[PDB]
UniProtKB/TrEMBL annotation:
Residues 2-93 form the Ig-like domain. It comes from the Eukaryota. Keywords: Adaptive immunity, Immunity, Immunoglobulin domain, Signal. This is Variable region-beta 8.5. PROSITE patterns: IG_LIKE. The keyword Transmembrane helix does not apply. PANTHER family: IG-LIKE DOMAIN-CONTAINING PROTEIN, T-CELL RECEPTOR BETA CHAIN. InterPro entries: Ig-like_dom, Ig-like_dom_sf, Ig-like_fold, Ig_V-set, TCR_beta_variable.
Length: 110
Protein backbone atom coordinates (compact mmCIF):
# COMPACT_ATOMS: atom_id res chain seq x y z
CA UNK A 1 0.00 0.00 0.00
CA UNK A 2 2.96 2.33 0.59
CA UNK A 3 4.67 4.30 -2.16
CA UNK A 4 8.15 3.42 -0.81
CA UNK A 5 9.02 -0.23 -0.11
CA UNK A 6 12.14 -0.74 2.00
CA UNK A 7 13.68 -4.22 2.41
CA UNK A 8 14.55 -6.16 4.43
CA UNK A 9 12.72 -4.85 7.51
CA UNK A 10 15.31 -6.57 9.78
CA UNK A 11 18.93 -7.64 9.31
CA UNK A 12 21.38 -9.44 11.59
CA UNK A 13 25.01 -9.38 10.47
CA UNK A 14 28.33 -10.59 11.88
CA UNK A 15 31.36 -8.23 11.98
CA UNK A 16 33.02 -8.36 8.54
CA UNK A 17 29.86 -9.35 6.63
CA UNK A 18 28.53 -7.47 3.51
CA UNK A 19 25.03 -6.03 3.89
CA UNK A 20 22.74 -4.51 1.19
CA UNK A 21 19.53 -2.58 2.03
CA UNK A 22 16.93 -1.98 -0.77
CA UNK A 23 14.62 1.01 -1.32
CA UNK A 24 11.98 0.69 -4.12
CA UNK A 25 9.36 3.27 -5.22
CA UNK A 26 7.12 3.20 -8.30
CA UNK A 27 5.89 6.82 -8.09
CA UNK A 28 8.54 7.93 -10.59
CA UNK A 29 10.23 10.12 -7.90
CA UNK A 30 13.49 11.71 -9.04
CA UNK A 31 15.13 12.04 -5.56
CA UNK A 32 16.00 9.25 -3.12
CA UNK A 33 17.72 9.27 0.34
CA UNK A 34 19.30 7.02 3.04
CA UNK A 35 19.33 8.11 6.71
CA UNK A 36 20.60 6.48 9.95
CA UNK A 37 18.54 7.04 13.08
CA UNK A 38 20.52 8.29 16.15
CA UNK A 39 19.86 7.60 19.89
CA UNK A 40 17.95 10.89 20.13
CA UNK A 41 15.83 9.71 17.12
CA UNK A 42 17.44 12.27 14.81
CA UNK A 43 17.83 11.07 11.19
CA UNK A 44 21.38 11.60 9.96
CA UNK A 45 21.91 11.73 6.17
CA UNK A 46 24.24 9.06 4.78
CA UNK A 47 23.82 9.26 0.97
CA UNK A 48 21.26 10.62 -1.55
CA UNK A 49 20.37 10.70 -5.30
CA UNK A 50 18.93 13.18 -7.84
CA UNK A 51 17.96 10.43 -10.34
CA UNK A 52 18.86 7.14 -12.07
CA UNK A 53 22.65 6.71 -12.12
CA UNK A 54 23.47 9.50 -9.58
CA UNK A 55 24.70 9.19 -5.95
CA UNK A 56 25.79 11.99 -3.52
CA UNK A 57 27.54 11.91 -0.09
CA UNK A 58 25.60 13.07 3.01
CA UNK A 59 26.93 14.09 6.46
CA UNK A 60 27.95 10.60 7.70
CA UNK A 61 29.05 8.69 4.55
CA UNK A 62 32.03 6.77 6.10
CA UNK A 63 31.65 2.95 6.22
CA UNK A 64 28.58 3.02 3.44
CA UNK A 65 28.25 3.08 -0.32
CA UNK A 66 25.07 3.96 -2.30
CA UNK A 67 23.79 2.77 -5.72
CA UNK A 68 20.97 4.13 -7.98
CA UNK A 69 20.65 1.50 -10.81
CA UNK A 70 17.21 2.68 -12.05
CA UNK A 71 14.56 5.31 -11.40
CA UNK A 72 12.77 2.97 -9.01
CA UNK A 73 15.69 1.59 -6.88
CA UNK A 74 18.25 3.16 -4.41
CA UNK A 75 20.45 0.64 -2.52
CA UNK A 76 22.68 1.12 0.58
CA UNK A 77 25.76 -1.12 0.84
CA UNK A 78 27.92 -1.92 3.91
CA UNK A 79 30.98 -3.64 2.44
CA UNK A 80 32.26 -4.90 5.85
CA UNK A 81 29.81 -4.36 8.76
CA UNK A 82 31.12 -3.11 12.15
CA UNK A 83 29.37 -3.03 15.59
CA UNK A 84 29.26 0.78 15.29
CA UNK A 85 26.81 0.36 12.34
CA UNK A 86 24.19 -1.20 14.63
CA UNK A 87 21.22 1.16 14.12
CA UNK A 88 17.82 1.73 12.53
CA UNK A 89 17.95 2.98 8.91
CA UNK A 90 15.28 4.85 6.86
CA UNK A 91 15.03 5.53 3.13
CA UNK A 92 12.88 8.25 1.47
CA UNK A 93 11.89 9.47 -2.00
CA UNK A 94 10.19 12.49 -3.57
CA UNK A 95 10.31 15.30 -6.10
CA UNK A 96 11.33 18.74 -4.86
CA UNK A 97 11.20 18.99 -1.04
CA UNK A 98 8.71 16.11 -0.71
CA UNK A 99 9.68 13.15 1.52
CA UNK A 100 7.87 9.83 1.21
CA UNK A 101 9.62 7.54 3.92
CA UNK A 102 10.07 3.79 3.91
CA UNK A 103 9.06 1.80 7.00
CA UNK A 104 12.65 1.36 8.27
CA UNK A 105 15.28 -1.37 8.64
CA UNK A 106 16.59 -2.56 12.02
CA UNK A 107 20.27 -3.59 11.68
CA UNK A 108 22.26 -5.44 14.40
CA UNK A 109 25.98 -6.15 13.91
CA UNK A 110 27.41 -8.81 16.25
Amino acid sequence: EAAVTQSPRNKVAVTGEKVTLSCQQTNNHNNMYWYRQDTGHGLRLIHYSYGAGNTEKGDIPDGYKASRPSQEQFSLILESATPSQTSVYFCASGGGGTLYFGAGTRLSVL
